[PDB]
Amino acid sequence: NGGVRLITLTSELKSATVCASHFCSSATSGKKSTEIQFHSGSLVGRTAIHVKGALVDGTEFTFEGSCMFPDGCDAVDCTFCREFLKNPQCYPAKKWLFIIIVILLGYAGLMLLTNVLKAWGSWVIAPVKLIFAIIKKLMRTVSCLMGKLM
Amino acid sequence: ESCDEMVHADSKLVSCRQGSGNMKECVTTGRALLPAVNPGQEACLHFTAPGSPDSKCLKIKVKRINLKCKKSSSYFVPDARSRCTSVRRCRWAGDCQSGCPPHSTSNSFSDDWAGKMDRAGLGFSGCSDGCGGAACGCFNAAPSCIFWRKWVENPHGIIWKVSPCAAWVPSAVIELTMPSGEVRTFHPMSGIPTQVFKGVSVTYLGSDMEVSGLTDLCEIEELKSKKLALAPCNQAGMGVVGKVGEIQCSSEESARTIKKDGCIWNADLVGIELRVDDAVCYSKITSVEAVANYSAIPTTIGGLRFERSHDSLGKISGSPLDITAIRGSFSVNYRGLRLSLSEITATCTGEVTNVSGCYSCMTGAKVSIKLHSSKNSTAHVRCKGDETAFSVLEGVHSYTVSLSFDHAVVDEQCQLNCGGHESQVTLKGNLIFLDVPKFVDGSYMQTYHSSVPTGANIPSPTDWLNALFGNGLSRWILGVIGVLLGGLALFFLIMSLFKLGTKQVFRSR
Amino acid sequence: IKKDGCIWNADLVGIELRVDDAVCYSKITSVEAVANYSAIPTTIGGLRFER
Amino acid sequence: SDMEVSGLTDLCEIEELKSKKLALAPCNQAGMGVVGKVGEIQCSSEESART
Ligand SMILES: *[C@@H]1O[C@H](CO)[C@@H](O)[C@H](O)[C@H]1NC(C)=O
Ligand SMILES: *[C@@H]1O[C@H](CO)[C@@H](O)[C@H](O)[C@H]1NC(C)=O
Ligand SMILES: *[C@@H]1O[C@H](CO)[C@@H](O)[C@H](O)[C@H]1NC(C)=O
Ligand SMILES: *[C@@H]1O[C@H](CO)[C@@H](O)[C@H](O)[C@H]1NC(C)=O
């Protein structure tokens, strides 16, 4: 499920490199049954495994194999593969619930906004500073008139 | 496998003749350019002749793109020991009156030393003084001439191969297949000729990637035990004592023996010490595991993970995390080659059988095409969106190729033509979408990563919300109405439940 | 490119060898390789260099 | 372990043969020497020291 596994019967594994369709990996530990993985969900479809390496005492080995990998398996929860994939739907009962929750949130937001739309506002706040500026101009004109009278 | 990135740069550029009687060619010369491809792809080079309907192609296979360096020089550094001998004699004549060398005589060999051998090696004809008297071996109050000769040996015979380099330019492997049928491999460099074979001079180009801590590194390797290590090595013959760069020689056969005529040493590599007619020699040569910054086969200095890739002409590699380099295009030049053309193509017609793959992604979508004809390989598929060329065999067989599509529901009509005959094909199937894979612990990159498609990154309203309701031609409205009614019913139910909960919370406190 | 008329100073072609190969690499750059390489239509500054 | 020294810069191991007397004092170098300190008229062997 995780990846491919290399089995050695002659001797231990010194170093080896595996190849895939569009990916490559290399790992070595020194045991008989070694496991080598590429990524999470990188091999999806029909591909051929081409392993090439050399064992101890200067002995090289080459093998070819084609393994059956699952195609319709996404296994995502909070990534971009959720909002873009709808054909396989590995977890069914989900899109209906998501759309229902979105509709509920939209209706709740609309109901909360209507309470303010129908019923302490800018149209009351602005006349305050407007009349303040008017009173400032009136005081300036009064000072100018006093200066003119002097 | 599949093919892409067609060029067709020098079509109809032949000056041939009747061609041995029925149909032959002479030479084709031009110049083209191949763009960068993902590791594990094929770049076909389809030629076009004015007389022949179709021609063969030239596939380029790339497997790994490792970070190697050039080869500034090559030499072998053998292991040496301390060997020396001396002789105690008396004056007894006028040969040892005052000193051993009168003014400049360095030939301190009176046809008695063992220096005239093939296994002796490098040495320095030096001399010193000894003791005199009845206890030292003489019978006259006069100094005695005592000569000494030292050299180096190699009992074991360990051979080392060092190759200094300070460039570290990107490189890759190319498995080229000629249209005639010959398949060979070679390792091109980033601007260095790759030993042009029958005119083909395909080279690789990089991007001059900087290094973090790669200033003084080499690729010293061992032959017997096949042990590799990363450590700063020396330079050419003009070197300094104190680090790597001890007594070397010219060839590998000159490494087992440390004899002259090929071995080079500057000075001060073996010392001499004596107290009383002893002339003992001590060793100052350091082994390979003695200098600083001596790494091993697994090296993780910086972001690069230097591994040991099994490959000819080089055993040094390394691959960091996904880099997604800018460009890795090639440059192919032709000088002279022959290619046979049939020009006897007959009626051929194929069809599509299967279709599958990813979305517009790395591996693409593979489509199986079946053909049937008498000619060996005369086919050229051309369609919108992507162009793919491949080779077939005689008779009826099955072939699988990959194309690039930009739509989930691939339902179009492409044109297929083999040789001179043409036909029409159709594709119908369902595709999926795969993004860039994520990193997992325990896994390390092997060669490199080319590119990952992450352009759109947005949900498409056409593909999304498709299998939720259904498919038809007038049932979509009914489905939308039913879903809306169910949503309104569930909304009313949830509102009633919330009102009941608030009523229960308010009273009965 | 024969002698008696052709002039070159030094260090215009490199040599590399590993095992009785003596391969040579190219360092000569073409005309479209240096900086500030213009074309037939040139509008550098107020001058419009035509042909 | 290459242990460092505190004040050991110019020291020697001059020893006497007849009386077997030892002393620590800075001595001279090879034949090319300077007059003013130890390093006076020397010779090659021990028998060449009596004369
Ligand atoms: C070893 O590497 C370090 C860091 O790059 C450097 O400072 C040091 O000089 C190196 N040592 C030698 C002997 O080159
Ligand atoms: C086409 O049909 C299925 C579809 O995937 C495939 O498994 C099968 O191998 C193909 N047919 C042949 C003859 O290869
Ligand atoms: C076609 O292929 C067969 C078998 O590979 C070979 O014997 C024959 O010569 C080929 N013909 C041409 C024209 O290439
Ligand atoms: C190109 O022109 C600019 C501005 O005139 C100058 O700074 C630069 O040095 C030039 N480049 C070369 C290679 O001469």
A106-142: b (≥16 Cβ within 10 Å) or e: eeeeeeeeeeeeeeeeeeeeeeeeeeeeeeeeeeeee
Chains contacting A (3 or more CB pairs within 8 Å):
B
Distance from CA of B6 to the nearest CA of A (A): 20
Using the mean position of ligand 2's atoms as its centre, give its distance from the Cα of residue B418 in Å.
Answer: 23
* Cα–Cα distances in angstroms (integers) from residue A108 to residues A102, B483, B486, in the given order: 10, 19, 17
> Using a CB-CB distance cutoff of 8 angstroms, which residues of chain B are in contact with residue D46?
131-133, 136
Main-chain dihedrals φ then ψ at residue B493, nearest 5 degrees: -65, -45
> Hunting for tokens 């179009």 — which residue is that?
B412
> Using a CB-CB distance cutoff of 8 angstroms, which residues of chain B are in contact with residue C18?
71, 74, 163, 313
Using the mean position of ligand 2's atoms as its centre, give its distance from the Cα of residue B354 in Å.
Answer: 6
d(CA B357, CA B432): 7
> What percent of the residues of chain C are helix, what percent strand, and what percent coil, each to the nearest 5?
5, 15, 80
* Cα–Cα distances in angstroms (integers) from residue B341 to residues B19, B149, B177, B478, in the given order: 10, 75, 17, 62
Contact B68, B314 (CB under 8 A): yes
CA-proximal residue: ligand 2, atom 8 (nearest) = B354
Helices A95-118 and B476-506 pack at an angle, to 10 degrees, of: 60
d(CA B37, CA B450): 7
Please tell me what resolution, in angstroms, this structure has. 5.2
Record the tokens describing residue A147, joined without a space.
């200066």
> Hunting for tokens 């460039």 — which residue is that?
B167
Q: Which residues does residue B429 pair with via DSSP β-bridges, in sequence order? A: B410
Instruction: Name every residue whose Cβ is closer than 8 Å to that of residue B212 and which is 6 or more positions away in sequence.
Output: B302, B303, B304
Cβ distance of B192 and C23 shorter than 8 Å: yes
Give the 3-state secondary structure of B170-227.
ECCCEEEECCCCCEEEECCCECCCCCCECCECCEECCCCCCCCCCCCCECCEECCCCC
d(CA B361, CA B340): 37
d(CA B115, CA B148): 11
Distance from CA of B311 to the nearest CA of D (A): 42
> What percent of the residues of chain D are helix, what percent strand, and what percent coil, each to the nearest 5?
10, 10, 85
Q: Which residues does residue A24 pair with via DSSP β-bridges, in sequence order? A: A19
Chain B CB within 8 Å of residue D44 CB = yes
Q: Exposed, middle or buried, B457 (CB in 10 Å: 0-12/13-18/19+)?
A: exposed
User: Amino acid letter at B292?
Assistant: A
Contact between chain D and chain A (3 or more Cβ pairs less than 8 Å apart): no
d(CA B192, CA B70): 9
d(CA C13, CA C24): 7
Q: Is B292 a pocket residue for ligand 1 (Cβ < 6 Å)? A: yes
Q: Which of helix, strand or coil describes residue C20?
A: coil
**What does the DSSP 8-state code read for residue B419?**
T
Task: Report which ligand 1 atom has the smallest distance to the Cα of B232.
Answer: 14
Q: Which long-range contacts (CB under 8 A, 24 or more apart) does B206-210 make?
A: B206/B169, B206/B170, B206/B325, B206/B328, B207/B170, B207/B325, B207/B326, B207/B327, B207/B328, B208/B169, B209/B67, B209/B170, B209/B323, B209/B325
User: Amino acid letter at B267?
Assistant: A
Using the mean position of ligand 2's atoms as its centre, give its distance from the Cα of residue B243 in Å.
Answer: 64
Q: Tell which one of B352, B354, B356 to mutate to probe ligand 2, the residue whose CB is within 8 A of the most ligand atoms.
A: B354
Which has the closest alpha carbon to B100: B135, B128, B65, B122?
Answer: B128
User: Amino acid letter at B121?
Assistant: G
Record the tokens describing residue B225, joined without a space.
């035990």
A59-96: b (≥16 Cβ within 10 Å) or e: eeeeeeeeeeeeeeebeeeeebebebbbeeeeeeeebe
> Using a CB-CB distance cutoff of 8 angstroms, which residues of chain B are in contact with residue C19?
74
Cβ distance of A17 and B310 shorter than 8 Å: yes
Contact B76, B254 (CB under 8 A): yes
Nearest CA in chain B to C22: B195
- Of the ligands numbered here, which is closest to the C-alpha atom of B429? 2
Task: Report which ligand 1 atom has the smallest distance to the Cα of B213.
Answer: 5
* Cα–Cα distances in angstroms (integers) from residue B319 to residues A15, B164, B289, in the given order: 16, 21, 26
DSSP assignment of D9-32 equals SS----B-SSS--B-------SSS
- Side-chain-side CA neighbours of residue B439 (13 Å): 8
d(CA B448, CA B412): 35
Main-chain dihedrals φ then ψ at residue B41, nearest 5 degrees: -125, 180
Q: Is B354 a pocket residue for ligand 2 (Cβ < 6 Å)? A: yes
Q: Is C35 a pocket residue for ligand 4 (Cβ < 6 Å)? A: yes
> Hunting for tokens 């040789």 — which residue is that?
B419
Q: Tell which one of B293, B299, B304 to mutate to probe ligand 1, the residue whose CB is within 8 A of the most ligand atoms.
A: B293
d(CA A2, CA A25): 14
> Hunting for tokens 């206890």 — which residue is that?
B135
Q: Which of helix, strand or coil describes residue B144?
A: coil
Chain C CB within 8 Å of residue B256 CB = no
Q: Which long-range contacts (CB under 8 A, 24 or more apart) does B469-477 make?
A: none
Record the tokens describing residue B438, joined without a space.
């994520």
Across the interface, which of C16, C24, C26 has its CB nearest the CB of B71? C16
> Using a CB-CB distance cutoff of 8 angstroms, which residues of chain B are in contact with residue C24?
193
d(CA A132, CA B153): 106
For residue B100, is it left (φ>0), alpha (ψ between -120 and 50) or beta?
alpha
d(CA B133, CA B147): 18
Instruction: Name every residue whose Cβ is closer than 8 Å to that of residue A98 and which is 6 or more positions away in sequence.
Output: none
